[PDB]
Amino acid sequence: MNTFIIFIILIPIVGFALLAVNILLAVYKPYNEKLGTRLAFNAAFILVAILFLPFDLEISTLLPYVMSIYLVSNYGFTIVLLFLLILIIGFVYEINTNALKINKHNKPNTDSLIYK
Amino acid sequence: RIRAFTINFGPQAAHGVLRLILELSGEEIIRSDPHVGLLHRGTEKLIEYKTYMQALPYFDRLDYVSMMTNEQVFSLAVEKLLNVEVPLRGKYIRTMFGEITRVLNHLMSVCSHAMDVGALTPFLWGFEEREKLMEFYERVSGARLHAAYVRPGGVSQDLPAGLLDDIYMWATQFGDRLDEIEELLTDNRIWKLRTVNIGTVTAQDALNLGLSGPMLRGSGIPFDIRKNAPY
Amino acid sequence: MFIGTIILVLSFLGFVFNRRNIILAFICLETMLLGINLILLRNSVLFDDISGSLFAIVIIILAGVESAIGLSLLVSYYRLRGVINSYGI
Amino acid sequence: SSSLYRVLRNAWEVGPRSYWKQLNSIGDTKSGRLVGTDIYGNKFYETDHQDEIHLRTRYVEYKEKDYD
Amino acid sequence: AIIATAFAETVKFSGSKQELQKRTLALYRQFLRGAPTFADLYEVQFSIPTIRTKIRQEFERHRFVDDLSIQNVLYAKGHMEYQECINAWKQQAQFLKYFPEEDDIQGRHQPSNFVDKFLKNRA
Amino acid sequence: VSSSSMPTDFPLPSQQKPNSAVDYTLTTLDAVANWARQGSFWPVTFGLACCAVEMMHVSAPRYDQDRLGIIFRASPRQSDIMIVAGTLTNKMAPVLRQVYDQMPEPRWVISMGSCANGGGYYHFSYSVVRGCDRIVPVDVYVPGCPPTSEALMYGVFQLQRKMRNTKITRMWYRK
Amino acid sequence: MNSFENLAQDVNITRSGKTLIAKGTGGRSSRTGYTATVFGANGFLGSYLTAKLAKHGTTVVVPYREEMAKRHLKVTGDLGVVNFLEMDLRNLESIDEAVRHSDIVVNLIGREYETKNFNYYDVHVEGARRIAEAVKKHNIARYIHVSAFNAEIDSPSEFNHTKGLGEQVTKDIVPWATIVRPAPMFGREDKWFLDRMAFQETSNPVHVIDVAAALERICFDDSTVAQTFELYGPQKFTQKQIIDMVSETLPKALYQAYTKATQAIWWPTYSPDQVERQFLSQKIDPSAKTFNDLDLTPMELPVSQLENKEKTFVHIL
Amino acid sequence: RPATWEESEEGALSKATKYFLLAEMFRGLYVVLEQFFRAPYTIYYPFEKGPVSPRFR
Amino acid sequence: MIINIVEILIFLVCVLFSVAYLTVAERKTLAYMQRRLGPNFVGYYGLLQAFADAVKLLLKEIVLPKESNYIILVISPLITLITALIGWVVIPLGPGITLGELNLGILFSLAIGSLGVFGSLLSGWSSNSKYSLLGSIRSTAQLISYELILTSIFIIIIMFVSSLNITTIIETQRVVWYCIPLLPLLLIFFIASVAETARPPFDLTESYSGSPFVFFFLAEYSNIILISAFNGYLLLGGYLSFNYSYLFNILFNDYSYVSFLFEGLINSSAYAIKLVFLMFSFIWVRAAFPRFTYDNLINFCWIILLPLLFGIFLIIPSTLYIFDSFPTL
Amino acid sequence: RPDAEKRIAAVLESFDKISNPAAITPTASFAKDLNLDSLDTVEVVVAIEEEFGIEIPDKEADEIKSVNQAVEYILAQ
Amino acid sequence: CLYEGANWFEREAYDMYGVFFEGHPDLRRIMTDYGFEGHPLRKDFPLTGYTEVRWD
Amino acid sequence: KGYSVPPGETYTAIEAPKGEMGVYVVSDGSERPYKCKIRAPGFAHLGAFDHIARGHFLPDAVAIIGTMDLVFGEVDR
Numbered sequence A: 001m002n003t004f005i006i007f008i009i010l011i012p013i014v015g016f017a018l019l020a021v022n023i024l025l026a027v028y029k030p031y032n033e034k035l036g037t038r039l040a041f042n043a044a045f046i047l048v049a050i051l052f053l054p055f056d057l058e059i060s061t062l063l064p065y066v067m068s069i070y071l072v073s074n075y076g077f078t079i080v081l082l083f084l085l086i087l088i089i090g091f092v093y094e095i096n097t098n099a100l101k102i103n104k105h106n107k108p109n110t111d112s113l114i115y116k
Numbered sequence B: 001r002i003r004a005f006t007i008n009f010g011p012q013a014a015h016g017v018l019r020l021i022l023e024l025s026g027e028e029i030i031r032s033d034p035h036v037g038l039l040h041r042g043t044e045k046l047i048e049y050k051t052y053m054q055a056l057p058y059f060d061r062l063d064y065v066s067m068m069t070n071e072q073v074f075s076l077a078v079e080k081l082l083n084v085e086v087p088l089r090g091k092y093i094r095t096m097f098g099e100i101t102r103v104l105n106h107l108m109s110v111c112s113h114a115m116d117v118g119a120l121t122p123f124l125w126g127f128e129e130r131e132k133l134m135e136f137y138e139r140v141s142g143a144r145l146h147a148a149y150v151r152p153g154g155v156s157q158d159l160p161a162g163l164l165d166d167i168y169m170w171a172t173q174f175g176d177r178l179d180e181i182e183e184l185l186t187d188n189r190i191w192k193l194r195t196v197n198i199g200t201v202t203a204q205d206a207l208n209l210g211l212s213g214p215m216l217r218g219s220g221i222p223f224d225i226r227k228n229a230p231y
Numbered sequence C: 001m002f003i004g005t006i007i008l009v010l011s012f013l014g015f016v017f018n019r020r021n022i023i024l025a026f027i028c029l030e031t032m033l034l035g036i037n038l039i040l041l042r043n044s045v046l047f048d049d050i051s052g053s054l055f056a057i058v059i060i061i062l063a064g065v066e067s068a069i070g071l072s073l074l075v076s077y078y079r080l081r082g083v084i085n086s087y088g089i
Numbered sequence D: 001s002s003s004l005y006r007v008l009r010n011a012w013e014v015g016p017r018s019y020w021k022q023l024n025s026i027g028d029t030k031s032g033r034l035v036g037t038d039i040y041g042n043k044f045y046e047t048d049h050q051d052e053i054h055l056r057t058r059y060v061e062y063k064e065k066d067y068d
Numbered sequence E: 001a002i003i004a005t006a007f008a009e010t011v012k013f014s015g016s017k018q019e020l021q022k023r024t025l026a027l028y029r030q031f032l033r034g035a036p037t038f039a040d041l042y043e044v045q046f047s048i049p050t051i052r053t054k055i056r057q058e059f060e061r062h063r064f065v066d067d068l069s070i071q072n073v074l075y076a077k078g079h080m081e082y083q084e085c086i087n088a089w090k091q092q093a094q095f096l097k098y099f100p101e102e103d104d105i106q107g108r109h110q111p112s113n114f115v116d117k118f119l120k121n122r123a
Numbered sequence F: 001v002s003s004s005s006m007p008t009d010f011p012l013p014s015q016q017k018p019n020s021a022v023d024y025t026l027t028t029l030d031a032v033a034n035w036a037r038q039g040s041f042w043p044v045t046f047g048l049a050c051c052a053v054e055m056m057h058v059s060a061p062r063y064d065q066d067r068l069g070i071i072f073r074a075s076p077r078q079s080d081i082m083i084v085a086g087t088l089t090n091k092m093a094p095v096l097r098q099v100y101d102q103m104p105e106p107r108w109v110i111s112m113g114s115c116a117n118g119g120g121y122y123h124f125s126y127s128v129v130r131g132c133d134r135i136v137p138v139d140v141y142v143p144g145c146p147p148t149s150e151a152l153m154y155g156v157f158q159l160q161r162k163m164r165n166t167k168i169t170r171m172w173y174r175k
Numbered sequence G: 001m002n003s004f005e006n007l008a009q010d011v012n013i014t015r016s017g018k019t020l021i022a023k024g025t026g027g028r029s030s031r032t033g034y035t036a037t038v039f040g041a042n043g044f045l046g047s048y049l050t051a052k053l054a055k056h057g058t059t060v061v062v063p064y065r066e067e068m069a070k071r072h073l074k075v076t077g078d079l080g081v082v083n084f085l086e087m088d089l090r091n092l093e094s095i096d097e098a099v100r101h102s103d104i105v106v107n108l109i110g111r112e113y114e115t116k117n118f119n120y121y122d123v124h125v126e127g128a129r130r131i132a133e134a135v136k137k138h139n140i141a142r143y144i145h146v147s148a149f150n151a152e153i154d155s156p157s158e159f160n161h162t163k164g165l166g167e168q169v170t171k172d173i174v175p176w177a178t179i180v181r182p183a184p185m186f187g188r189e190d191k192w193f194l195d196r197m198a199f200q201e202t203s204n205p206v207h208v209i210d211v212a213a214a215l216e217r218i219c220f221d222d223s224t225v226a227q228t229f230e231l232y233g234p235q236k237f238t239q240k241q242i243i244d245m246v247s248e249t250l251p252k253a254l255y256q257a258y259t260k261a262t263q264a265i266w267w268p269t270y271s272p273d274q275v276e277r278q279f280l281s282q283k284i285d286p287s288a289k290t291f292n293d294l295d296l297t298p299m300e301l302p303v304s305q306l307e308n309k310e311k312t313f314v315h316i317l
Numbered sequence H: 001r002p003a004t005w006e007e008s009e010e011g012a013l014s015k016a017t018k019y020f021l022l023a024e025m026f027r028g029l030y031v032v033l034e035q036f037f038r039a040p041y042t043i044y045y046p047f048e049k050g051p052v053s054p055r056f057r
Numbered sequence I: 001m002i003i004n005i006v007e008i009l010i011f012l013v014c015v016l017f018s019v020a021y022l023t024v025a026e027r028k029t030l031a032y033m034q035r036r037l038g039p040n041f042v043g044y045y046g047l048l049q050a051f052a053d054a055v056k057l058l059l060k061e062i063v064l065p066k067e068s069n070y071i072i073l074v075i076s077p078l079i080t081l082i083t084a085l086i087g088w089v090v091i092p093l094g095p096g097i098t099l100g101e102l103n104l105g106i107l108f109s110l111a112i113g114s115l116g117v118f119g120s121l122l123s124g125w126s127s128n129s130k131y132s133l134l135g136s137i138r139s140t141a142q143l144i145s146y147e148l149i150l151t152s153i154f155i156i157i158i159m160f161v162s163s164l165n166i167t168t169i170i171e172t173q174r175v176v177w178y179c180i181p182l183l184p185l186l187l188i189f190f191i192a193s194v195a196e197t198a199r200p201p202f203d204l205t206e207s208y209s210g211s212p213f214v215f216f217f218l219a220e221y222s223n224i225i226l227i228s229a230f231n232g233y234l235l236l237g238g239y240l241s242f243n244y245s246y247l248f249n250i251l252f253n254d255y256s257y258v259s260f261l262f263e264g265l266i267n268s269s270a271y272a273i274k275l276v277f278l279m280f281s282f283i284w285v286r287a288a289f290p291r292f293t294y295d296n297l298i299n300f301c302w303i304i305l306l307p308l309l310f311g312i313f314l315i316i317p318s319t320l321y322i323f324d325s326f327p328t329l
Numbered sequence J: 001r002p003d004a005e006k007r008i009a010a011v012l013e014s015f016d017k018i019s020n021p022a023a024i025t026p027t028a029s030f031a032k033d034l035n036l037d038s039l040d041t042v043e044v045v046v047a048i049e050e051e052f053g054i055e056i057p058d059k060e061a062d063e064i065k066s067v068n069q070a071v072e073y074i075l076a077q
Numbered sequence K: 001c002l003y004e005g006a007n008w009f010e011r012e013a014y015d016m017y018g019v020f021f022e023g024h025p026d027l028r029r030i031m032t033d034y035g036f037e038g039h040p041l042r043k044d045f046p047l048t049g050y051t052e053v054r055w056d
Numbered sequence L: 001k002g003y004s005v006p007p008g009e010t011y012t013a014i015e016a017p018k019g020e021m022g023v024y025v026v027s028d029g030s031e032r033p034y035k036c037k038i039r040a041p042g043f044a045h046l047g048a049f050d051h052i053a054r055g056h057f058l059p060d061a062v063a064i065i066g067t068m069d070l071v072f073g074e075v076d077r
C-alpha cells in the first residue's frame, strides 16, 4: 500500500499497453522476401566475462566493510588492506600475462633480406 | 584447419554500391575479396560511339566528386592528339578550377572518412564549404555538380563578371574554417589511436601495387605529377 | 525449511536424471546451492544470529567462484571437440 | 543570427497576427518590406536588417495553406 | 591480391588433348558433387536431378569440338562458371538463367509449320 | 434479399467532402496519423552513384533535412521510404528489389535523378536497367541529371502532399 | 527472340469490326493491339491475369478502388500499357466509361463477406448487372464473367445463390458472354489457404497461374463465346488430406457465435456463410468445357562423421 | 634518428598530466562548444531559394 | 490511498514526459553544434516531435523473422523497458521525496542496473544468425566490463557516508559535494556512465520495427537520465544549491503550504539543473568524437582504469585513517 | 558387405542406356559391359559415393572403371 | 608473377576483351553481370547488347 | 560532325586528388574515338585492399576504405 509497489506493477502496464497499441493498430502483411554452422572466436572474448566474475565478487565483498567502517577502526582497516593487496597481486598477474588481448596474427614480417 | 567465417560488407560505411566479401577468424581478416561491378554501366563502350565533344560528359560522370579534374584529363589527351595550344588565361583558369575541385574532393573524402570512423561534425562543416564552392561552379558552368566546363579546346566560356573578387572573399575565411576542423581530429587521441599503424604500406610495394597520389606519398616517395611532369 | 528442502531435492533429481544436455547439470548445481542458502538463512532468522548469515555470505562467493572455474573447464572441454554431446561428457 | 533578441524584435515589428501566420508558415520570424505581389497572389519581402546571413534577405509569403 | 579465392585455379593451358580431357572429367565431377548445395543455396522449386541433367546437357553441347585451343577457352569459361556458382556470388535470378524452359509454359500457339510461322510472320 | 440498395450517385474519393460526425471523426484521426507519417520521414537510400552526393547536400547545413524531420535510418527494416538515387545496373536489380522487399508495409519510393528513371545517360547500354520502374513501383520522379537539392526537396514536399490525401481511415469507410 | 504466344496470328479482327495489326516481336516494348478492362485487377486472380495480359503489350485499362495497392501493377507493363482510373460501382458513369474503349473486358468483382455498404446481392448480381449493362450499351466483343464453383440458385448458400443469380443476370443481358467457373484456387500467399494454415468435403484446388493462363487462352479465340467453362484440377481432395499434406511439408453454433464477435473489426474476418460453404462440395457440370478445351493440363497440388571431421578444425584460435 | 624517452624536453609529470587530464580532448571539446554559440546556415527551402546564376539549367 | 496514487502518476507523468523531450533536445543541440537548425516542422518551435515519431512507430509493421524466438524477441524489450524504468523510484527530488524510502537505496539502484544487461544478450539470441550473436557478445562484454567500475565508484563514495540510504548521502553532502574532493572520480564516473549506456563515444556494435524499437528507444534514454541521476546524487549535490536560510527568514514567517511548495521548487530545481547539464554533456561528448575498436575498449577498461581504481581503493581509506575520520552509521 | 554389393548394384540399375538391368555381374566394367559414356563413368561413380556419404580423391575416382573395383574400393571408411 | 597490382588490370582486360593471361590466379569476370555471355568491348558485340531485365 | 583528331594513340595522366588518373585514347582519324580507356586511381587502390587489410581487425577495415577514398565511379565504370 505504499507508493513503491504501484510503480513495480505499473511500469509493465505502461509496456503491455504500448505494444498492445501497435499490435492492435499496425499492418502485419508479411511474405518470404520480407522475412529473413558456428564460428570460432578468440580466447579474450570468453576470458573477459569469465574473469569478470572474480572481480565482481570482490567488489561486493567490500560492501560489508564500507558499512562497518567505524566499528572496526584501525583493525578491520588493516584486514581490508591485506585483502585488497592479495587481490591486487592476482590482478598484476593478469596484466603481466597480457591475458585480455586479442593480438593481430600478421606482422610486417620483420625478417631481413639476405642472399646466396 | 582454421575455418574462416564469411560475410560481406554488402551494398546497404561501404560508401554505397560496393560489395566486400571478408573471411574472418574471430576478429582478424585472413582473406579479403572486393566485388565490383554493381555500378558498371559500360561508359567505355559508349564513348566509342559519340564524338569527342559528346564524349566529354562521360568523364565528369565517373569520379563524381572531382569533376573538373576528370574533364581536364580527357581534354589534355585530346589536346595532345590535336596538336593545339590553349591560351594563357585558359591555362590559369583551369589551374584555379582544378584546385577548388581539389579542395572539394579532399573536403568530401576527409569528412566522409571522419564520419564512417565516427566523427560527425566535420562532415557538416566541410559540406558547408562545399556549398560555398558549388555556387562558384553554378556561376561558372550552368549546373552545380556536373559541369561540362573544361573542354578539349580549352574552356567552355569566360568567367562571370564579378567572381574573381568573390573567390578571394571565400579564401580569406576558409583559411580558418580549415584549422578549426583540424583541431578536433589531428591531436584527438581517439582519432589518433584509430589510425596510427592501420593501413601501413611499404614504399617498395606501393610501387608494385600501382598506387599513387596520397597513398604513394603516404609512404615517403616524393612523386606528384604537377611538379614532376607539369602541365 | 520447506522451500529450501524441495528446491534442493527437485534440483538434485533434475541433475541426476539429466540426459538431455550439459548446462542443465550446471544450473541444477546452482539451484542446489540456492536451496542450501534458503534453509540456512531461515535458521539464522529463527535463531536470531548472524552466523548462519556469515556462512551464507561466504557460500555465495564460493558458488560464484565455482561457476567461473567450471565454466572455464567447459570451455577447455569444448576447445578440442567443437561439439558438446547431448548424452553427456 | 540565432538570437532570442532577433526573434523578439521581429515579433514586435511584424505584430501578433502576422507572427502567428509566420509561425504557422515558417519557423523563423522575418521583417520585410513588401517589394510586390504575384499574379497568383504571393507577397514577397526583402529584409535589410544587419544580422542576416547570406541567402536570407528575400522570401515569399504564400497564399494557400498547401504551397509550392 | 596474393591470396586467391577458395575454389580458384591458376589458369593453365594444355598442350595435350588428353590432359584437358582429364581436367574436363574432373570438372564434371566437381559440378555434380555441387548440385545439392546449388539446390539448397538458390532456393529452387524442383529437385537435384534436374540440376544434374542440365550439367550433363551443357556438357553434351560441346562434345564434338576438335580444336584444342577452343576446348581450352571452353574449359576456362566452365571453371569460372563453377567458381561463381559454388561461392554463392551469382544470385537466384541469374542461376535460373540456365532454366528458361522449366519455369513456365510461355503460352499457346507455338509455331512449328511454315504457315503458323507465317500467320504471325515469325513474331 | 432481392432489392439492390446501392445509390446511383455517390462521390468518388477525390470529390467527396465530409458531412456526418463519423466523417469528421475519421477525417481528424486520418489527419493525425498522416501528420505523424509526414513530420517523421525516414529515406532509405539505394542511390549507387553521383546523385548520392546531391543527397548529402540535403544533409548539408545550407539545405537541412532534419529541420523537415528527415533522417537516414540506414536499414530498410525501419525506413518508411526508399530513394533510388543513381543508376540501376543489371547486376543490382535483384539487390534493389531485395532492399525494397524488407521495408514495412506503409512504404513509398521516390526516384531521384535521370539515371534512375528511364536509364538516362546510359540508356543504350548493355548493363543497365532502364529506370527502376521495372523493379520497384515508384510514386514520385525527381528529374535532373544532378537533380538540384532544391528539386529533391521539392520532390519530398510532393511526396508529403501525396501523404496528405492517402486517406487510410476514410478508405476503410468505403468512400 | 521473343514471340507472341497468346496470339494465333498477327492480324486479328474483332467481332465489333476493329482491325488490329500487332507490331514487332513479342515482349515488353511491343504491342498486340487489344484493349482490355480487368475489373478487380487488385485481386488475387487479377494481378496474375493482367501480369499475363500486359506482358505482350495488350493495353490494360484497370479501374481501381484504392490507389495504394494498385501500384504493384505498374511494374507489369510497358510505359503506356496499363492505365489506372478510379471507380466506384455506385457511380454508373465510371463503369460505362472504363469499358468505353475496351474490346475485351473481364469482371472479377466478388466479395467473401457482407459489409455495411455491400451484401452479396449487390456485389455479385447487381454490380454484374451494371457491368453487363455497360457492355450491352457499348457493343463490346468478348464479355468474360468469372464466377464461383458451386454456383447454383437452389443452393442454401447466399454466396452460391447470388453468384448463380449473377450468371442469370449476365446471360439475361449479354448473350455472348463467356462465363467461367474456377475451383478452389491455390497460389502464393492466398487469403484462406496455405498461409492461413501453414473436413469431409471434397473439392479440387487449381493453381492460379493456370486459371489465369486458361482465362487468357479463352480471351483471344472466339470459339469461346456463349459457353460456360469449369476449371478443376486433376485429383479430388479432402480437407484433412490437404492439411496433412501441408503438415508434413512443413460445436457449430458457438463457433458461429465466435465469428459474430470477431467480425466488428477492420481486419478481414471470416464470413458466416463460409462454414455453410464448407459442408457444400464440388459438384461440377458435365455439359461444360474444362482445361483440355483450350490446350493445357493444370498443375496438381502435390552426426557420427561430422564429429570426427570437427576433430580436425580449430574452434578457439 | 627518432628521439628516445630520455632525450625529451618534457618532464614525465608534465607529459602524464596531459595524459590523465585529457588536454587536447578538452581543446577539441571546446571547439564545438564555441560552435554551439554561432549562426546556422540553413535556409528554408520553399520560402527561400538558394543561388542562381543565369547560366543555370 | 488517493494520496499515493496521485503522487505516483504525477511522478510517472513527469519522468515519462522528460524522457520524450530529451530526444527532441538531443536533435536540436546536435544540430546547433553542427551549425544547422534542429526540427521546427512539427511543433510551434519543433516540440512534440518525439510524440510524432512515437505516433508513427506505433503504426509500424512488426517483422518476426524465420530465425527467431517470437516470445523472447518481444519480451526482451519489456524486461529492458521495465528495469530501465524501475530504478526511478529511489532518486530523491528533495529530502525524503522518493516513491519508496528504503534504507538500502544504493543496493537497489545497483541491483537494478545489473538487470539491464540481459535485454542486450538475450536479444542476440533473437534472430539466431552467426553475426547476430557475436555482436551481442561484444555488446554484453563491454556492458559488464564498465558496470564493474560503476559499482566500484559507488563503493568508494559510500566509504564517506557508511549508509546505503540515498538522501542520507545528500544530507551528508551539505558540508561539501563529493566531486570537489574527488574530481578524477567525476571524470572516471562520467566516462563509465557513457560506456554503460553504450553511447556513441563508446559504441561499437551499432558500428526491428515498432514496439520492440520504441521500448529499446525509451529504455536507452531512461538509462541516460537514470545514470545521470546516480551522478547527481552521489557525486554532485543531489538537491543542494546553497544555504537559503537567510532568504527564507526575509520572506516567510511560518510554515505554510506555499513555503513547502517554494522549498520543493528550489530543491528539485537544483536537482534538475544538475541533471540537465549532465544530459547536455552526454550529447556534447556524442558530437565531438569518433568511436572505439573493441580492443581499445577492453584495454581501456581492464588495463588503464581498473589499476588506477585499485590505487583509489588503497588511497581513500588510508586518508580516512591518517586523520581519525571514519564515518559513523 | 553382401548387401553393400546389393546396394552398389541397387543404384547402378537406377540409370538408363541400360537395356538389361540383369547384366550387372560383379566385375561389370562400365564402358564395355554396360555401354556407358565418357561422362557416365563419372556420373555413376558420383552416384555410388553419395549413397554412403564418403568422398573420393580423383585418382581414387578416375581409376574406377568396373563394379569389382568399386566394391574393392569401398572399405576406405 | 612480377607485379601484384597487375592482376585486376589483366582481369578487366579479360572481361571486356576475352584476352587470356596464362598463369593467372583467379582469372574470371569483373565489372559485368555474373551470367553475362559475351565480351562487351568488342566490335562484333552491339551497343545495347543481347538481353534486358524486367520483373516478372 | 565534330572535329577530326589526327590518327594516333596517347596515354595522358594528371594528378587527380585521389591519385594519378589517366586516360588512354586511340584515335582512328575519325571524329569518334576508336578506343577510350580510363585508368582510375581508386581501381588500383581497391585492388590493393587485400594486400594491406590482412591481419587487421574488422573496425580497422573501415578506416582503410576512407584512406583509399573509393567513390566507385572510379572503380567500375
Ligand SMILES: CCCCCCCCCCCCCCCCCC(=O)OC[C@H](COP(=O)(O)OCCN)OC(=O)CCCCCCCCCCCCCCCCC
Residues within 6 Å of the ligand: B189, B190, B193, H013, H016, H017, H019, H020, H021, H022, I184, I185, I187, I188, I190, I191, I194, I201, I281, I285, I289, I296, I297, I299, I300, I304, I308
Ligand atoms: C598526473 C595527473 C594526475 C596523476 C594521478 C593519476 C590519475 C588521476 C586522474 C585520474 C583521471 C583519469 C581520467 C581517465 C584517464 C584516461 C587516460 C587515457 O588517456 O587513456 C589512454 C587510452 C589509451 O592509452 P594509450 O594506448 O597509451 O594512448 C594514449 C595516447 N597518449 O585512451 C583510450 O583508450 C581512450 C581514451 C578515452 C578518453 C575518454 C573519451 C570520451 C570521454 C570524454 C569525457 C569528457 C568529459 C568532459 C565533460 C565536460 C562536462 C562539462
Ligand SMILES: NC(=O)C1=CN([C@@H]2O[C@H](COP(=O)(O)OP(=O)(O)OC[C@H]3O[C@@H](n4cnc5c(N)ncnc54)[C@H](OP(=O)(O)O)[C@@H]3O)[C@@H](O)[C@H]2O)C=CC1
Residues within 6 Å of the ligand: G040, G041, G042, G043, G044, G045, G046, G065, G066, G069, G089, G108, G109, G110, G111, G112, G118, G123, G146, G147, G148, G149, G182, G183, G184, G185, G190, G192
Ligand atoms: N478461395 C478463393 O480464393 C476463391 C475465389 N473465387 C472468386 O474469384 C474472385 C476473386 O477471388 P480472389 O482473387 O481470390 O479474392 P479477392 O481479394 O481478389 O476478392 C475481392 C476483389 O475484388 C474487389 N472487391 C470486393 N468487393 C468490392 C467492391 N464493393 N467494390 C469494388 N471492388 C471490390 C476487391 O478490391 P480490393 O483489392 O481493394 O480489396 C478485390 O480486388 C471472387 O469473385 C471470388 O468469389 C472463386 C472460388 C474460390
Ligand code: SF4
Residues within 6 Å of the ligand: B061, B064, F048, F049, F050, F051, F052, F085, F086, F087, F112, F113, F114, F115, F116, F120, F121, F144, F145, F146
Ligand atoms: S542521375 Fe546523373 S548525377 Fe545521378 S548518378 Fe546518374 S548520371 Fe550521375
